[PDB]
Structure 1
Amino acid sequence: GAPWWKSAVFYQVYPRSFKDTNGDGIGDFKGLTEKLDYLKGLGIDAIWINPHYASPNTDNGYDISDYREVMKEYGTMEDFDRLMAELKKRGMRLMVDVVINHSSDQHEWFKSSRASKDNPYRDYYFWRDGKDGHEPNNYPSFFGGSAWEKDPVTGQYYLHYFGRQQPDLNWDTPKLREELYAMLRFWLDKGVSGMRFATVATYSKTPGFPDLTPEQMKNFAEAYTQGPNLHRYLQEMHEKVFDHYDAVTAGEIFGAPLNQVPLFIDSRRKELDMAFTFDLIRYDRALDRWHTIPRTLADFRQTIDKVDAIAGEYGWNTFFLGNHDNPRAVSHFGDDRPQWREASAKALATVTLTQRGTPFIFQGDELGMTNYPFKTLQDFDDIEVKGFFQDYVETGKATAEELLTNVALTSRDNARTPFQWDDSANAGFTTGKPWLKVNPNYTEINAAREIGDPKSVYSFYRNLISIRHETPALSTGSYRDIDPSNADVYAYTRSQDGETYLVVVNFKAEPRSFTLPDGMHIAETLIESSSPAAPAAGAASLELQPWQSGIYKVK
């Protein structure tokens, strides 16, 4: 048999932007709880929530100052326990975000660590003498400037791959790893069903902190995933924690070459259960992470093909076209112009729900939400954009307008604008002023408008989730790309126990044709989007409308 997580459909909730119930403009636990009937109705089996722990929010939850307290903004431990209970009444499961590559610089461990070199917490972090009058080495940070920050209290620099207020935790220190395992046990003892591990591939650092080479410097994210003790630490965490619970684990494998992914997910290695990879979501992103390189569907499917292959026989992949760190799915992979937004959003839904692996739908994508129309750099909240400003504008490599032009298409903030519930003030997200502006298209794009409409993007996701739930080959069946070279129509099969399904999606806003492979004919049409008529039983070919998608049982 296959674990519940292999045939589950997950929904990712970014609490901060899902539903606010007290008018401070920030979503909270009570709002999410209020909306569980909505997600149950869509057909969601489990929810992954972004960090919900006490945090100064320099990186919206990913800078944790106390791993055993809930974030003040989201509510209390009681609201969290109530979220858990309400999910359970509905047979739903909760996956929480685990951030243990680093903590906030307000965590008590860090306040202690920085006091002196002999403090019992000194080695919970990485402290090192500067070199040749400057930092310990040339490591850059993802959020700007050096990954090393000098602390006058002792004269040494501490390590921070991410923000200056997100010091990296030292996994080479046994006592620190034991503190981390105990923390995990605290949440797992509360009944949590899954854990998503933030930047799980950077836990291990390189002994000696040598300078990155010129080449390594072009893609430093990759070098940070090459620590020598990485799998040893993940195997220990598994042996000491996960082997005693029934929780599914999912690693955010940020920066690692795809060839290394199996080391994290091969069930026999006893590390993680499934992977979140970045090969597809960043397939058209330049190395500097704020420019886009044009790509075709051929690149899209070939990437998916390579990723599916890495899961081999004992690994498992998650599948997603969107999350809180990337531009909106329909805007990024589809066509968000008014005339094609709904049609392309439905096509992308068909792709997402028929991929081999566990699908994660990001809040709002089921409604066809789009990127946001940023007008000035001041319209972004993201610390990452401030880091691009520091690294490229202040340095004269680019102008503020160039940064604006490009980052509008790639910013994480595109996925963080308030969820569009209805067409009331601020789309019903809040009675106050939203922490991030609501997209003006909320008047045409909102859940209340779509839930009662048989033809809406929402209803289409809902029917796809039902179809996937009733069709085993669609979750655990094999996957085969029919033609990796085709840049027009994405076609593939899913098979299991003699049943084979065909998925065909036109990625062009023009009619196209698709001829089934020799000896294959349509048997039944499960569903189609943007189609005036289902093909006839026995069809050897398909005529497709712009952005048409469909799932068919073949014979």
Structure 2
Amino acid sequence: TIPKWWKEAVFYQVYPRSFKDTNGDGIGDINGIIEKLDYLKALGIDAIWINPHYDSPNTDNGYDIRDYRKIMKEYGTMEDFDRLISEMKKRNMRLMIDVVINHTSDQNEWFVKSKSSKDNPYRGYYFWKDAKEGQAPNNYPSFFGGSAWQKDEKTNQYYLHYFAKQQPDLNWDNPKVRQDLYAMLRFWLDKGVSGLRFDTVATYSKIPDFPNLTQQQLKNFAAEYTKGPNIHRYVNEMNKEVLSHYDIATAGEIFGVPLDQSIKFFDRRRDELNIAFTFDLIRLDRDSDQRWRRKDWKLSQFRQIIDNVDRTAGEYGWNAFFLDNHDNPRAVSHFGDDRPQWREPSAKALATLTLTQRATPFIYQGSELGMTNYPFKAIDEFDDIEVKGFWHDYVETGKVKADEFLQNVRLTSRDNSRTPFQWDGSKNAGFTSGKPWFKVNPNYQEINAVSQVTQPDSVFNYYRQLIKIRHDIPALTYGTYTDLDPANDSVYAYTRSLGAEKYLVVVNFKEQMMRYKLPDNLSIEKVIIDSNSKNVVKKNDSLLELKPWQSGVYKLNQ
């Protein structure tokens, strides 16, 4: 085990668009982030990861980049960006930015030139192909709807886009492309950014000759897209030519990658990436074919995935741990219980799990307040292009009924985590003086930052306490992870141990009071923290009485 600031750091993810608006146009901006750095510092955050801040038409809210060297108009200036880095440095905070290089906006200069003629120098920066019998080159489907091939009538060829048609994929097989991307990365790294989070990092390498996908592959095509024969050669090349020249932390969003193949991206000996962002846990209850649909799950399934993810990282890799982010529903709604009676306690329980895993924890803006999913009714209330893609492919084709579709996307939509951060009880929760780009959840009157910061028993302050505890206990970062019983669907319990120091974490996922006898003659030395109190725990206790959703951390004897 080697110590790294990024293994011990508590990260906080900021979705600029919905964090804090400072000029009344309804859109979060960089000055808003700077304005809240003291709030985050009080919380105890060590580093901030911000979603795409580059010039973009926003077909995919920042993930379709028109100019990699320019700040998105709505977010501010290069000046604001440099100030953010500086104000953060002052507070001993490190900044991580989002690197979106699997594709670019179709308004990106390289693509504008690329589509102009078959002989343009930049034609090879993307993937162009002739029709096949007047049809698309092959049967590749797009994550965002319809075919992954878009016809261009000027040149009579189709271009590839795994995501939106406004997001053409870059030709990593072209050396000039890699070199230009490396140059772009150095531009941002030389400004002092401390980390890079790579968006869909495992799809850079395409399949030679683009052969059709089998009928079966069509039901799980992301898995086929991550089989590029040169993905690791490329990630490692990027490490040698760029990454290795700076003291930074790199996270890889390995979308589509099976857990067994994940280690090749993060084994420290391979010189590729540092922190793994896996989907196994966060989308454990998601259908792999109809990717918008959810199904029931049990704690035993949840904890069994955590154990597999932990063992796969093992000795040479490293994991990030999070239960929500901008591409998923809210943690308290998804993994806890967001009803009025259980929201705060279940929220605190997820907080406990999050800050005590053998991994870098990532907290998503607003989840430290227990923000919940938004009550979307009609299909036109969603903003997400992904949602619209699913709606077209599944509802407008008559494959699935609108009501059943909506029942599911209300539970799985990325938009659930994109409603404006709830700062206070004023109009629009204090997010903006204008009109929010996306509607604010009505529950902000009950759930807001100003209210919780001064309340010692608040969700915000529970996170603050847990972040302090993790900072104070090496075992909680580096301690080995052991699940006391992977088949238990009621009480989640595990130990974290480093040398002679051993700690226990427990969460009663049940709505009923539970008595839990510890195994292996384990006994309690002292309570580190617990959501309860009045639930007296004494030295040498080996039986815990847990109230519904109760949770806690204890130091064990020996």
Q: Which category of TM-score, normalised to the shorter sequence, fits these structures?
A: over 0.9
Deviation at 1:310, TM superposition (A): 0.7
Q: Is the 8 A contact 1:128 1:136 kept in 2?
A: yes
Deviation at 1:402, TM superposition (A): 2.5
Q: Is the 8 A contact 1:531 1:545 kept in 2?
A: no
SS at match of 1:68: strand
Deviation at 1:531, TM superposition (A): 4.2
Q: Which residue of 2 aligns with 1:337?
A: 339
Distance 1:235 1:138 in 2: 30
When residues 548 and 531 of structure 1 are mapped into structure 2, their CA distance, relative to the original with a 3 A threshold, is farther
Encode CA deviations 1:502-523: one digit per residue, 9 max, x unaligned: 0011001111121111221000
Distance 1:11 1:264 in 2: 23
Matched AA of 2:237? E
| Alignment root-mean-square deviation, CA | 0.7
Deviation at 1:530, TM superposition (A): 3.3
Q: Which residue of 1 aligns with 2:454?
A: 452
Q: Which residue of 2 aligns with 1:43?
A: 44
Q: Is the 8 A contact 2:535 2:545 kept in 1?
A: no
Distance 1:249 1:329 in 2: 24
Deviation at 1:290, TM superposition (A): 1.2
Matched AA of 2:239? H
Distance 2:376 2:457 in 1: 30
| Equivalent in 475, 498, 503 of residue 473 of structure 1 | 475
SS at match of 2:511: coil
Matched AA of 1:154? T
> After TM superposition, where is structure 1 displaced by more than 6 Å over at least 4 residues in a row?
none
Distance 1:307 1:132 in 2: 45
Encode CA deviations 1:461-514: one digit per residue, 9 max, x unaligned: 000000000000001111001100000000000011210000011001111121
Q: Is the 8 A contact 1:530 1:547 kept in 2?
A: no
Deviation at 1:453, TM superposition (A): 0.5
User: Map of 1:329-478 to 2, 5 A cutoff?
Assistant: 329-478=331-480
Percent of pairs with identical residues: 70
Q: Is the 8 A contact 1:181 1:237 kept in 2?
A: yes
Encode CA deviations 1:224-273: one digit per residue, 9 max, x unaligned: 11111000000100000011111111000001100001000000000000
Encode CA deviations 1:399-426: one digit per residue, 9 max, x unaligned: 3333222111110000000000000000
SS at match of 1:479: strand
Matched AA of 2:6? W
Distance 2:133 2:431 in 1: 52
Q: Does 1:318 align with 2:315?
A: no
Q: Which residue of 1 aligns with 2:202?
A: 201
Distance 1:531 1:112 in 2: 65
User: Map of 1:118-129 to 2, 5 A cutoff?
Assistant: 118-129=119-130
Deviation at 1:133, TM superposition (A): 2.1
SS at match of 2:216: helix
Q: Which residue of 2 aligns with 1:234?
A: 235
Number of residues paired by the alignment?
Answer: 555
User: Map of 1:266-277 to 2, 5 A cutoff?
Assistant: 266-277=267-278
Deviation at 1:393, TM superposition (A): 1.4
SS at match of 1:355: coil
TM-score by length of 1: 0.99
Matched AA of 1:525? V
Deviation at 1:147, TM superposition (A): 0.4
Q: Which residue of 1 aligns with 2:248?
A: 247
Q: Which residue of 2 aligns with 1:67?
A: 68
Q: Which residue of 2 aligns with 1:166?
A: 167
Distance 1:531 1:415 in 2: 32
Distance 2:61 2:471 in 1: 34
Q: Does 1:108 align with 2:105?
A: no
Encode CA deviations 1:25-69: one digit per residue, 9 max, x unaligned: 110000000000000100000000000000000000000011010
Distance 1:534 1:379 in 2: 48
Q: Is the 8 A contact 1:16 1:26 kept in 2?
A: yes
Matched AA of 2:336? G
Structure 1 residue ranges without an equivalent (≥5): none
Distance 1:173 1:480 in 2: 45
Q: Which residue of 2 aligns with 1:507?
A: 509
